[PDB]
Amino acid sequence: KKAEYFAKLREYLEEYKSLFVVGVDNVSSQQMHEVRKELRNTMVRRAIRGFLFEKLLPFVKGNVGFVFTNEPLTEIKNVIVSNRVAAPARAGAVAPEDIWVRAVNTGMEPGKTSFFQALGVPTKIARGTIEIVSDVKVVDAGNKVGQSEASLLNLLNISPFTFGLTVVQVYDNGQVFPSS
Amino acid sequence: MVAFTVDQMRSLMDKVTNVRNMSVIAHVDHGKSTLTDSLVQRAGIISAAKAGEARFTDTRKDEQERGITIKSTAISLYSEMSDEDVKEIKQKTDGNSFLINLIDSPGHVDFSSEVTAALRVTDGALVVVDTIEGVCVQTETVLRQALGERIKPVVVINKVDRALLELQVSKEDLYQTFARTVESVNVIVSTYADEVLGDVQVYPARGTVAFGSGLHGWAFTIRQFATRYAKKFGVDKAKMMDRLWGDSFFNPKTKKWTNKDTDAEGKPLERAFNMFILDPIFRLFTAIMNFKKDEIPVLLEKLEIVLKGDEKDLEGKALLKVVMRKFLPAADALLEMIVLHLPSPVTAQAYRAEQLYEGPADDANCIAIKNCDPKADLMLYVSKMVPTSDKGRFYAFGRVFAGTVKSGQKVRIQGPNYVPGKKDDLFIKAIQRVVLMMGRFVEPIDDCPAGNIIGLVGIDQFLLKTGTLTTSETAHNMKVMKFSVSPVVQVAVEVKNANDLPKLVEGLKRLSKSDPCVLTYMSESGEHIVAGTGELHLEICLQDLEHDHAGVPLKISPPVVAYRETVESESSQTALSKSPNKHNRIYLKAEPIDEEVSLAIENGIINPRDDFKARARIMADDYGWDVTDARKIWCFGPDGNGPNLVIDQTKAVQYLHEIKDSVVAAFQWATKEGPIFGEEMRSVRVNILDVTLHADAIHRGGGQIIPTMRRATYAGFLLADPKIQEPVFLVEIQCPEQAVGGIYSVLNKKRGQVVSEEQRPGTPLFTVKAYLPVNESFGFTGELRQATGGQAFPQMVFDHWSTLGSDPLDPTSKAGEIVLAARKRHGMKEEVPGWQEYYDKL
Amino acid sequence: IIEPSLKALASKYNCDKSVCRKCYARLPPRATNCRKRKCGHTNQLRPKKKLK
Amino acid sequence: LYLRAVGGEVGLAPKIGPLGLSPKKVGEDIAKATKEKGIKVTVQLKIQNRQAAASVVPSASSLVITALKEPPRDRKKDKNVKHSGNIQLDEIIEIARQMRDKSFGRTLASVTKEILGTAQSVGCRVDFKNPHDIIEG
RNA sequence: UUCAUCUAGACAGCCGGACGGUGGCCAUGGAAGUCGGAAUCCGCUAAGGAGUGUGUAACAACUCACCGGCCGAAUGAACUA
Ligand SMILES: Nc1nc2c(ncn2[C@@H]2O[C@H](COP(=O)(O)OP(=O)(O)OP(=O)(O)O)[C@@H](O)[C@H]2O)c(=O)[nH]1
Ligand SMILES: [Mg+2]
Ligand SMILES: [Mg+2]
Ligand SMILES: [Mg+2]
Ligand SMILES: [Mg+2]
Numbered sequence A: 001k002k003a004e005y006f007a008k009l010r011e012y013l014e015e016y017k018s019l020f021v022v023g024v025d026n027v028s029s030q031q032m033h034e035v036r037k038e039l040r041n042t043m044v045r046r047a048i049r050g051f052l053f054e055k056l057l058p059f060v061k062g063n064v065g066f067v068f069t070n071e072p073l074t075e076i077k078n079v080i081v082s083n084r085v086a087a088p089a090r091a092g093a094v095a096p097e098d099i100w101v102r103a104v105n106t107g108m109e110p111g112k113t114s115f116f117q118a119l120g121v122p123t124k125i126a127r128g129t130i131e132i133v134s135d136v137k138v139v140d141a142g143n144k145v146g147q148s149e150a151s152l153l154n155l156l157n158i159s160p161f162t163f164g165l166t167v168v169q170v171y172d173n174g175q176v177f178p179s180s
Numbered sequence B: 001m002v003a004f005t006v007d008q009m010r011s012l013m014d015k016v017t018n019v020r021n022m023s024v025i026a027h028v029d030h031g032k033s034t035l036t037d038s039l040v041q042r043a044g045i046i047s048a049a050k051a052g053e054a055r056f057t058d059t060r061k062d063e064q065e066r067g068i069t070i071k072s073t074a075i076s077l078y079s080e081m082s083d084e085d086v087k088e089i090k091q092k093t094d095g096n097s098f099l100i101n102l103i104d105s106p107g108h109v110d111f112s113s114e115v116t117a118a119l120r121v122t123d124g125a126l127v128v129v130d131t132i133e134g135v136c137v138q139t140e141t142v143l144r145q146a147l148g149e150r151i152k153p154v155v156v157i158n159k160v161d162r163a164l165l166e167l168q169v170s171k172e173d174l175y176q177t178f179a180r181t182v183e184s185v186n187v188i189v190s191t192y193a194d195e196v197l198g199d200v201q202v203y204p205a206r207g208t209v210a211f212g213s214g215l216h217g218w219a220f221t222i223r224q225f226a227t228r229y230a231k232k233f234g235v236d237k238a239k240m241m242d243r244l245w246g247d248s249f250f251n252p253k254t255k256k257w258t259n260k261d262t263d264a265e266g267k268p269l270e271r272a273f274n275m276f277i278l279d280p281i282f283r284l285f286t287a288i289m290n291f292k293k294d295e296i297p298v299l300l301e302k303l304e305i306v307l308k309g310d311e312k313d314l315e316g317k318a319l320l321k322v323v324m325r326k327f328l329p330a331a332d333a334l335l336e337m338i339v340l341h342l343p344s345p346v347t348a349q350a351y352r353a354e355q356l357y358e359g360p361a362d363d364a365n366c367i368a369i370k371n372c373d374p375k376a377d378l379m380l381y382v383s384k385m386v387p388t389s390d391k392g393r394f395y396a397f398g399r400v401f402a403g404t405v406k407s408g409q410k411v412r413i414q415g416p417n418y419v420p421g422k423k424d425d426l427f428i429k430a431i432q433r434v435v436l437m438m439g440r441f442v443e444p445i446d447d448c449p450a451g452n453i454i455g456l457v458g459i460d461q462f463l464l465k466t467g468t469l470t471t472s473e474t475a476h477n478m479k480v481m482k483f484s485v486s487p488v489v490q491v492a493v494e495v496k497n498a499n500d501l502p503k504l505v506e507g508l509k510r511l512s513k514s515d516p517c518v519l520t521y522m523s524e525s526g527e528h529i530v531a532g533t534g535e536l537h538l539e540i541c542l543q544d545l546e547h548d549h550a551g552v553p554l555k556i557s558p559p560v561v562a563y564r565e566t567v568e569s570e571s572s573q574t575a576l577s578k579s580p581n582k583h584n585r586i587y588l589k590a591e592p593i594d595e596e597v598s599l600a601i602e603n604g605i606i607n608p609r610d611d612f613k614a615r616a617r618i619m620a621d622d623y624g625w626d627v628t629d630a631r632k633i634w635c636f637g638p639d640g641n642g643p644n645l646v647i648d649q650t651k652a653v654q655y656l657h658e659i660k661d662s663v664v665a666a667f668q669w670a671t672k673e674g675p676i677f678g679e680e681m682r683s684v685r686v687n688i689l690d691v692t693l694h695a696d697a698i699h700r701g702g703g704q705i706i707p708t709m710r711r712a713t714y715a716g717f718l719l720a721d722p723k724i725q726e727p728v729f730l731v732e733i734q735c736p737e738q739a740v741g742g743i744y745s746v747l748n749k750k751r752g753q754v755v756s757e758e759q760r761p762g763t764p765l766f767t768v769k770a771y772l773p774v775n776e777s778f779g780f781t782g783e784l785r786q787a788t789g790g791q792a793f794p795q796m797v798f799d800h801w802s803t804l805g806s807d808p809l810d811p812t813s814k815a816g817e818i819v820l821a822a823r824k825r826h827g828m829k830e831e832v833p834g835w836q837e838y839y840d841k842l
Numbered sequence C: 001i002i003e004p005s006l007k008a009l010a011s012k013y014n015c016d017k018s019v020c021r022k023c024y025a026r027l028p029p030r031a032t033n034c035r036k037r038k039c040g041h042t043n044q045l046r047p048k049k050k051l052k
Numbered sequence D: 001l002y003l004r005a006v007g008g009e010v011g012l013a014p015k016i017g018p019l020g021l022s023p024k025k026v027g028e029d030i031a032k033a034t035k036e037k038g039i040k041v042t043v044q045l046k047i048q049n050r051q052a053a054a055s056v057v058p059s060a061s062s063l064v065i066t067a068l069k070e071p072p073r074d075r076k077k078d079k080n081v082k083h084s085g086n087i088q089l090d091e092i093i094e095i096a097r098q099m100r101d102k103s104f105g106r107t108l109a110s111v112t113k114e115i116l117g118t119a120q121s122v123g124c125r126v127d128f129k130n131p132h133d134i135i136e137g
Numbered sequence E: 001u002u003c004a005u006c007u008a009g010a011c012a013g014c015c016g017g018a019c020g021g022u023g024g025c026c027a028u029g030g031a032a033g034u035c036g037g038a039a040u041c042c043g044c045u046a047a048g049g050a051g052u053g054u055g056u057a058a059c060a061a062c063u064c065a066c067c068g069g070c071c072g073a074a075u076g077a078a079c080u081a
């Protein structure tokens, strides 16, 4: 029964003629159940030392997984970030960008300025909903994200920091090709 | 600052456009009844000297030493202005002297009755807001209460002296809190303000916000500062007074204005608000609290000081109190925002008319109200009734919207129940004296136009709480003016000595008059109950009773609760009692009534004075019930009219018509005081199976049928699994979403269950309704308040009766421990007579 | 109102802890036994209760 | 673009609808057009823009099997349990399950169906847990 | 003393994911994993329970199992005296 899954991840051996190595930095499981609709880890790095050929093994550490489709190797290179994470943090997270906001109406009902006041943002009410005046930045590059500030952007005001679905390298029927 | 004249104020009541009918509004210890003090100085009344703490609209002696306004006392004031200021009125105006009709108001939730009373007779509102405490929970509720009758608000952010000293605040954050406040104040407006104005939002640059500390004596607004300093830079006011609020700065060494934070290439520039509207004031705190006196004068002189015969020999913090009151005196900021931005009676009655009219909202008088017409038939609402200063006799306090009112004038008073058609709350007597009011001294005036608030001595024999008196035959009333607190906390009042009772029953009548929603009534259980809106509100109402209205010693007690004796079985045996005269016998069983149909007479569909053949027909079909057993009914009970009935089920029996007299007699002695504990009963039917009457007559009187029957039915009661019906309230509360969880948390500890959970659109403001057993309901409202942070406003009414699956007859159970003590207190014994007595086993 | 960032910072020192069920002592939130010997370092530890 | 919950016949609303400039009465009466075999718990969907009502009916997988039962029912006249599970009608189960957006990352036409039949929660449906390696569609 | 996991990479620690049918059916004024009862099934799967905690009025958003990362060599649990 762990018989069964030693045998399973060595189960689908070679199968194909060209491939693509990828990374799983901050990507959903719903975000994966998407890509598999289009058809077109260390228990494996010894699989190759076993069934040998290739010397492609120095490319693996971090959260890595694998794809296969033999069609034009850039015809698939476009469903890559066809997914577009733009994950708005979990409940508060780290600062990978430089924060800012500008004026405009927000179309939200004026009962949510509760968050606004918690960050020293001047606000007024017009046309019925929350317009913002005199826009400012929350705090500097690489600094604090309060549950206040996150709680504001994260779900109130869709304005995230993208955590894309990337890809590192590829073997083109015998040797490997860095980028596009 | 000099007091002017009784009939001089009478003369400007004619110039309606210069009248300001408004109130003050804030959360409890926010500074308003001291704020008012600073204005009646600028009308003579109070000494400008150490008379800024004996707050005058706190007329009451307990209002004065508890330091909280209790009743919404009132005062009208005469005021001077300068022509330079009286141009900026976008409503027709007349001269340079105005009359402010104000109500300083209590701001506890228990007293929201006094503020809704204060608003209904006013057009404007001045909301006070502590800087430190900001906008607390009651501010939001009394803001809702103003827009509820469409009042225009203007704000003043107060006790900013707390901001400087206790909070060691810098300049920008202090501004930032001002920003933080005004933002949250307008989000209240954009939800409840009537979507008929829009212009009712509040912003400081538009001159609808002030800043100060009414205790220390001073206030300002950006407009009062706009002119004051635009007179030297020679530049304008309009675009200038936009540059002082918000992100717009100046940057000296560059000498031209800015747009956004602008940074000035490192360490940015401060808002016009900071170095140019507060750099004066902060230096006063810093350079006189830190005692820099050698700096004090020539810094005093840089910014236009003046001293006194004692104030120069008076340095910091008693200095700051004394210098800044002279720097930016209070009324100047206030009169500005009140005369400029608050609606005169004519500019206000025209949109509050149609909604404030009981009859057709275009009635011939509502016309003359919109016009603020002082010549129509007199049209006036009395909102409160205020103690006389003699023994218990009440001016009536309202505002008139049409015609005039003269001392000695015949008038029809139309109470809350009147319609123009027939005999209703219509008394037709005259007014002894019209009189306009101050800090309880009133000044008799003989004639008063429309659009002003006044008193009225000569009535209150004819009013009970509120009323609307007119001069036209068919002038409809005014809408009934419901407040957000309903009379929920309640106790029973008995008089300590046995004979003061007459003084106690007039006191309740006199008490009902005083507070707009104190209730007093006789209960089914036979008590005088005095109900209020909070455990605190009830305190004062009884203080006012034990001393003034009743003036006798009386002690209070939780009210006794009315149960009913009922059945839920069909006689675990049959039943037979005999007589003293052991010659006659009755046989019967007793069964429960479908609670559906016991209602059917409680709602008056089956009655004794009516006739059967219809009694029979109705009950048979739909009521899981018989057709001929609904013909041979004999009587109701108790009181001849109650929901416990009898019918005949016996064979060719001896002499039933000459005891039908005496069987209903005993039936009535059993239905208002039965077994378990002698309360009235409901929902049990009794059917008679055989009867053995003696012969002759005198061996069958009432004296032998009624002692058997009352005996012979109690027997049939305890057989049929006796149960008691506890009374249940239907309670509705309006609560915001935030603390809505505190409602369900109390409802189950107090054994409630919700019927409907719903929200008002846009509002948070849910309104949950539930069934509350009154047994588990005492102190409930006060504990719901703490469970909600005061953000809940319950409103209870009786709904129905309910049995209990806990068992009554056992004293251990939590439905028999209730009537455990019901006997001991009532004066009875330990257990309740077993069915073995009342049943002659033979 | 303590600003949310530091309401949780202090909450970590005062509110978010564990205590001993028979020694009453205050103990690190993840800790497994009590450090005080009077209770013989009993493992019976509850978390320190929190407010509202 | 919004969505609703279980409604049999009729339908609270304006807590979210009146603030959205919609006269909520014209929509709650119209919401009984997508809600009426057919009276059970079903999801809804409304997506409009500054106008009158525009609301649709969604493919609640729970609902399809319920109509595919003895749809004879009365509201509160039953008072026991909604054990309305009638004949599995495995073909109609497939048509509904096929119509279900071919969602759940549908590998097979049957990969969608194995989720539907697995709702032995819904009722008897003559056989709970149908076969595994069978014919397909 | 007994039984377990680990170079096919364990234990701790730190980091990424924690799905879809679907708010599953019973009921509930309201119960969407998280008052509760019963069906504890399935699909996509490197994996995710018809859901181990906080929380909501109900959702939310935080959480864990469960799946990978990083580190590379030993660790875990119930017991006895
Ligand atoms: N530091 C400071 N304290 C103030 C200021 N204004 C009022 N207070 C204090 O606040 C307290 C309550 O205010 P009051 O004016 O007496 O009455 P109110 O609070 O407006 O009305 P109630 O709801 O009936 O209590 C008083 O005891 C004052 O001492 C102020 O401007 N600065
Ligand atoms: Mg006084
Ligand atoms: Mg007194
Ligand atoms: Mg006061
Ligand atoms: Mg305080």
Ligand SMILES: [Mg+2]
Residues within 6 Å of the ligand: B387, B388, B389, B390, B391, B392, B393, B548
């Ligand atoms: Mg008196």
Ligand SMILES: [Mg+2]
Residues within 6 Å of the ligand: B623, B624, B625, B626
């Ligand atoms: Mg019957």
Ligand SMILES: [Mg+2]
Residues within 6 Å of the ligand: B800
């Ligand atoms: Mg009922």
Ligand SMILES: [Mg+2]
Residues within 6 Å of the ligand: C018, C029, C030, C031, C045, C046, C047
């Ligand atoms: Mg612990």
Ligand SMILES: [Mg+2]
Residues within 6 Å of the ligand: none
């Ligand atoms: Mg590990």
Ligand SMILES: [Mg+2]
Residues within 6 Å of the ligand: E020, E022
């Ligand atoms: Mg799911």
Ligand SMILES: [Mg+2]
Residues within 6 Å of the ligand: E031
């Ligand atoms: Mg549930």
Ligand SMILES: [Mg+2]
Residues within 6 Å of the ligand: E031, E034
């Ligand atoms: Mg829950």
Ligand SMILES: [Mg+2]
Residues within 6 Å of the ligand: none
């Ligand atoms: Mg499975």
Ligand SMILES: [Mg+2]
Residues within 6 Å of the ligand: none
């Ligand atoms: Mg969730």
Ligand SMILES: [Mg+2]
Residues within 6 Å of the ligand: none
């Ligand atoms: Mg984890």
Ligand SMILES: [Zn+2]
Residues within 6 Å of the ligand: C020, C021, C022, C023, C024, C025, C034, C035, C036, C039, C041, C042
């Ligand atoms: Zn210990």
